[PDB]
Amino acid sequence: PFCGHIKGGMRPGKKILVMGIVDLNPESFGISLTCGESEDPPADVAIELKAVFTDRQFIRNSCVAGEWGEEQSSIPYFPFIPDQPFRVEILCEHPRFRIFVDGHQLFDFYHRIETLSAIDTIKINGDLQLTKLG
Numbered sequence: 001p002f003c004g005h006i007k008g009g010m011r012p013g014k015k016i017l018v019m020g021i022v023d024l025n026p027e028s029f030g031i032s033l034t035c036g037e038s039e040d041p042p043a044d045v046a047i048e049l050k051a052v053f054t055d056r057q058f059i060r061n062s063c064v065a066g067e068w069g070e071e072q073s074s075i076p077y078f079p080f081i082p083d084q085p086f087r088v089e090i091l092c093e094h095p096r097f098r099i100f101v102d103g104h105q106l107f108d109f110y111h112r113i114e115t116l117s118a119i120d121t122i123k124i125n126g127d128l129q130l131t132k133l134g
Contacts (some may be wrong), residue, residue, distance in 0.1 A: 002127035003037045004133050008090045009117035010046075016122060018088045019106075019132035022080050028052045029126030031088060042066075043121065046113040047097055049088070051080050053127075060099075064111035069112055076106060085131070090114060092122045 006016065009127060010033065018031055030050045034043040045063035052059065056078035060068045079101040080086055089100040097112045124130050 001037075001123060002130060005037075005123040006033075006122060007009065008120075010119040011116055012092060012093045016090045016092075017132065017134040018073070018090075018122070018124065018130070020086065020124075020128040020130045021085050022082050023127040023129070024083045026051075026053045026080075026127035029127070029128045030124070032100045032123040033089075033090065033119050034121045034123055035113065035115075037121045037123075038113055044113060045108050046111070046119045047090070049090075049099065051078075051126075053080070054081070058106065059111045060107070062107050064113065074107055079104075079106060 028051060029051045032046055032048040034045065036043040042063070044065070048061050048063070050059045054103050056075055058075050058078060060072045087102050091098040091100065096108045098108050120134070
């Protein structure tokens with residue numbers, strides 16, 4: 001798995017760009033914004049985005065002190081295709097993240113972790129090749 005540092009953490013108006021290529025026979029991948037890079041014990045998770053290909057879900061949740069929140073799943077469509085490039089953009093606003101895939105807003109996620117400047121790590125894992133981070 002991969003960790004990228006976000007200098008200064010998140011703040012309103014800041015946008016994280018992730019581009020990659022989905023694997024040919026994917027099961028799932030994840031893109032998370034976390035408070036630090038620790039894997040053991042796991043850093044608190046401000047937002048995890050998990051693409052699950054078997055039932056075409058794009059699920060979101062947060063994790064604080066080991067406790068996951070309420071999973072959110074509403075989607076207009078499942079935006080990823082095996083073997084195809086994608087662009088995910090996470091826009092931070094004061095009340096919420098807004099998530100865009102290939103330029104289109106898919107959903108918002110209202111902050112559970114409200115110390116946005118502590119959200120200083122992007123973690124990427126699973127059945128993709130990561131091609132750009134910005």
